[PDB]
């Protein structure tokens, strides 16, 4: 919003893992899908820093499922890039598309393959 220090502060608390700050900001009308200048998202930052509890807090806070950066990557692609199975599971149970791809033009299968993580590959290859 106007003078949206709420967005940057919620993002910094999101990748900081400071839960109480995120709760306080949520009580302060924090924009759930507030992003940076580059288009990264609090869910993506939570995937980066591996604060899963922040992932659940944000998804129950009213977060989206196909958040895209300037690189356009959906959080499914980001998590398949990391190698964390639990984050992938808790995001795919929301119903993220697997037949789509970001502007890099590759499915999450490809990014699971080149990042060497098999677990994500069998998880996605069972999907429709």
């Amino acid at each position: 919003h106007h003078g949206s220090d709420l967005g940057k502060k919620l993002l910094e608390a999101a990748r900081a893992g400071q839960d109480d700050e995120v709760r306080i900001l949520m009580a302060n009308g924090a924009d759930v899908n507030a992003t940076d200048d580059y288009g990264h998202t609090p869910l993506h930052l939570a995937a980066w820093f591996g604060h899963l509890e922040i992932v659940e807090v944000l998804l129950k806070a009213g977060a989206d499922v196909n958040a895209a950066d300037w690189l356009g990557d959906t959080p499914l692609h980001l998590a398949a890039r990391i190698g964390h199975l639990e984050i992938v599971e808790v995001l795919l149970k929301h119903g993220a598309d697997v037949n789509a791809q970001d502007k890099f033009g590759k499915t999450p299968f490809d990014l699971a393959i080149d990042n060497g993580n098999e677990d994500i590959a069998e998880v996605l290859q069972k999907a429709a």
Binding site: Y38, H40, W48, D69, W70, L71, R81, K103, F104, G105, K106, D110, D114
Partner: protein
């Protein structure tokens, strides 16, 4: 401005001609009506007064045909002079034989008024003679009518008429001058704007290739046009890339004047790129002693390798010819490669079209590995070479490559003027109508005094409103005035003008409501004053035409049509005749002035339109000029042909990302996103330069993925209250802020670390400008290649520094650690020092 003020009336002829011809028609027609009057109806006792009418008819038709002559283009002024002299004599003669107790004063005063107006408006003569003739005519008429209050009234009528006339004359003159001046400006601007367009197009084609420029000057990308106040990059296959470097380049630059080098390189590269356009291969850029080109970059060609090899041979031929010419023994290392490359433009400052791959580095290295005087072709070049030349294999003795040796004018001000005129002339007309009384001091009607008061109040309020609006008095407050001004649009002007133009007729009828039908002098006086009033109804040229014409005619004559029945009839017929003529005058005259106002407006708008169109083009061109060269050499070339200079000491830093080499994943179609991110990174790097304190730093150019900058040369001004060495330190913190920015972006970069090799040096260098009809500023010297090589022998995240620069910086506060000993070409062994301290774990 004698030439100016002569051409001014050089351009004003046909309008003057048209006014003259209308004047002649009118005077003839009026004389004909008075001949008819004197002949058929009344005055049947004499033929004396019709022969002069007939002769004036014939002199009019004579002038009508006379105007066509060639002894007229510089003699029409005195032609009008002689015609007005004729009219003067005829009018006074028609007056002379009167006062029998044979014509009333109404006809005399009429014919006086039309003579005076056709004098003032159309004849187009200088001011002082016009006014002296007017006053002479006035006095002659008023003293020849004697053959005193009534006479004094007539004289005051003369003065009011003269005021109206002189005002209208001045207005016509000013409006005539201004339109010619404005159209002159509008004519002047177009040629300069066309010149500026050509300069802009030339410079655009200079900084960047033919194909993209011709695609984009139809503004196919609006982002490109807004940026050049954005573009696209591609990837291409099977292209030839050639490099060449001067052998012993430092040797020719031992102790010269740093000037012959600039010119000789100009000539060399002119020959080379001349042969380039004559051989259908496209140059890219140069690095000091290195000149390199590509073939089939913007549009691939089937036989580009042949063009590339022929360029190599032609370069060999040109260098050997120049060696035979000026007698300098030089040879020219050549390298050639074929492969795939992605081409595009990086940055928004000093941006130049360029190409990228591993193949470009491979070609540069294989040039460095070849032998001088022979081109080093590759197996990739040999896949389709058709072996129509000498096949010789030359390999490094210390990849399937071979060696080939060859073969005023303000609308609101006029409102002040004409309101001033209306109020003063109306006030004087009321003065005289009040002055009619000689025997009775008080007027029996009060309505005259009531109307006088209403008029004086309305005129003074309008006057004070106008003077506040024009002078910007704001004597009480601004916002009260503002809501006292905005109302006047198209309708308020119509209505206030209608009232202000009508009201003198009501003023003259102030006195006629009482008795005038008994005595005979009263009615003749009313006729005189009413025509005097009705003629005044033309001034307010800011209004429209038909409104003022109809208003003046109705509210000035129709009341006499009403008072005609209150019964003297023969005087009635003559006075309706004179008023018919008078309205005939006013219609044409007011039309003639409204059209001139309209055309003046139609001109001034386009004048300012073109004036605003030129300015953006000028600023755009100046910005592009600033894009390429420094301002100093720009203003120096404004009086010169070339540029060349030396500096005995200057600092320079080189910097390039090192871990970019693994980041060329090409799974994506084109791999364009990574270079996009690089583009925002370098754009941020340029935005860093935008700080006002950064006037001491010169980013030379972008070199592939690298970044080179210098300092301490733009400072041509030296002060004794200053230390002339602070440029080196400030450039050192410039490197520091570069380090900080790349660290911050690495933080903001998603899962990839960016590290860079950076090296610093300082020494004597030289500067010059190369391209002609193209442009490129560049630097050479002994320490530039040394700094590049030492930066090549650098460590990531470490500021490698030359030994002498280390010495000059150690006492400045910064602390370093010795790294090791590095042997470098040209200067031999050299020591190396590192700025970062305790960065790693050990």
């Amino acid at each position: 401005s004698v030439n100016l003020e002569e051409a001014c009336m050089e351009r004003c002829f046909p309008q003057t001609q048209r006014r003259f011809r209308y004047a002649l028609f009118y005077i003839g027609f009026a004389c004909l009506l008075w001949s008819i009057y004197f002949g058929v109806h009344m005055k049947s006792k004499l033929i004396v007064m019709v022969a002069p009418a007939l002769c004036f008819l014939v002199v009019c038709v004579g002038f009508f045909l006379f105007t066509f002559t060639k002894l007229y283009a510089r003699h029409y002024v005195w032609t009008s002079l002689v015609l007005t002299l004729l009219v003067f004599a005829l009018t006074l003669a028609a007056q002379f034989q009167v006062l029998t107790p044979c014509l009333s004063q109404v006809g005399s005063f009429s014919m006086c008024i039309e003579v005076l107006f056709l004098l003032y408006t159309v004849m187009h003569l200088p001011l002082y003679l016009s006014l002296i003739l007017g006053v002479a005519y006035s006095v002659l008429f008023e003293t020849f009518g004697y053959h005193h209050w009534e006479l004094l009234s007539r004289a005051l009528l003369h003065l009011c008429i003269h005021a109206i006339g002189i005002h209208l004359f001045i207005m016509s003159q000013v409006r005539s001058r201004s339109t010619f001046l404005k159209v002159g400006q509008s004519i002047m601007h177009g040629k300069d704007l066309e010149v500026e367009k050509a300069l802009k197009e030339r410079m655009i084609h200079s900084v960047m290739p033919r194909i993209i420029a011709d695609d984009l000057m139809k503004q196919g990308d609006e982002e490109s046009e807004n940026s050049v106040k954005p573009f696209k990059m591609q990837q291409i296959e099977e292209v030839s890339i050639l490099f060449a470097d001067i052998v012993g380049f430092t040797k020719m630059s031992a102790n010269k004047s740093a000037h012959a080098l600039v010119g000789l390189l100009n000539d060399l590269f002119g020959r080379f790129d001349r042969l380039c356009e004559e051989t259908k291969c496209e140059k890219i850029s140069t690095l000091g002693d290195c000149y390199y080109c590509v073939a089939g970059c913007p549009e691939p060609r089937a036989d580009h390798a042949y063009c590339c090899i022929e360029m190599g041979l032609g370069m060999i031929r040109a260098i050997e010819q120049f060696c035979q010419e000026k007698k300098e023994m030089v040879n020219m290392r050549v390298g050639v490669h074929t492969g795939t490359v992605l081409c595009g433009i990086l940055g928004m400052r000093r941006f130049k079209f360029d190409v990228w791959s591993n193949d470009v580095n491979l070609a540069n290295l294989m040039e460095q590995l070849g032998v001088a005087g022979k081109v080093h072709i590759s197996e990739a070049t040999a896949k389709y070479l058709d072996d129509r030349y000498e096949m010789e294999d030359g390999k490094v003795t210390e990849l399937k490559t071979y060696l080939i040796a060859g073969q005023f004018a303000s609308a609101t001000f006029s409102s002040l003027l004409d309101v001033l005129l209306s109020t003063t002339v109306f006030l004087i007309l009321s003065i005289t109508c009040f002055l009619r009384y000689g025997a009775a001091s008080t007027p029996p009607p009060p309505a005259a005094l009531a109307v006088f008061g209403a008029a004086l109040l309305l005129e003074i309020l309008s006057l004070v409103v106008s003077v506040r609006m024009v002078f910007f008095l704001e004597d009480v407050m601004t916002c009260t005035k503002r809501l006292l001004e905005w109302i006047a649009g198209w309708l308020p002007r119509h209505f206030i003008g209608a009232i202000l133009v009508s009201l003198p007729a009501l003023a003259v009828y102030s006195h006629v409501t009482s008795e005038f039908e008994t005595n005979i002098h009263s009615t003749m006086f009313t006729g005189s004053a009413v025509l005097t009033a009705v003629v005044q109804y033309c001034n307010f040229c800011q209004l429209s035409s038909w409104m003022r014409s109809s208003l003046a005619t109705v509210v000035g004559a129709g009341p006499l049509l009403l008072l005609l029945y209150v019964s003297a009839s023969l005087i009635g017929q003559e006075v309706i005749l004179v008023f018919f003529l008078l309205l005939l005058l006013v219609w044409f005259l007011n039309r003639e002035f409204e059209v001139s106002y309209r055309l003046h407006y139609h001109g001034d708008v386009e004048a300012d339109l073109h004036r605003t169109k030129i300015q953006s083009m000028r600023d755009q061109a100046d910005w592009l000029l600033r894009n390429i060269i420094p301002y100093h050499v720009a203003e120096q070339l404004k009086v010169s042909q070339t540029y060349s200079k030396n500096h005995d000491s200057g600092g320079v830093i080189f910097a390039s990302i090192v871990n970019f080499s693994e980041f060329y994943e090409e799974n994506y179609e084109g791999g364009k996103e990574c270079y996009r991110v690089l583009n925002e990174l370098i754009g941020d790097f340029d935005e860093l330069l935008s700080k006002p304190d950064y006037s001491s730093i010169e980013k030379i150019k972008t070199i592939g993925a690298t970044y080179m900058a210098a300092s301490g040369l733009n400072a041509t001004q030296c002060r004794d209250g200053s230390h002339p060495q602070e440029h080196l330190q400030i450039l050192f913190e410039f490197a520091k802020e570069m380090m900080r920015v790349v660290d911050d972006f690495n933080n903001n970069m998603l899962w990839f670390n960016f590290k860079l090799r950076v090296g610093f040096n300082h020494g004597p260098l030289t500067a010059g400008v190369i391209g002609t009809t193209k442009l490129l500023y560049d630097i050479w010297g002994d320490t530039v290649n040394i700094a590049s090589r030492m930066d090549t022998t650098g460590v990531e995240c470490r500021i490698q520094v030359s030994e002498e620069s280390y010495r000059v910086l150690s006492k400045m506060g910064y602390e370093f650690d010795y790294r090791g000993t590095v042997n470098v070409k040209g200067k031999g062994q050299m020591k190396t020092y590192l700025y970062p301290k305790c960065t790693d774990s050990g």
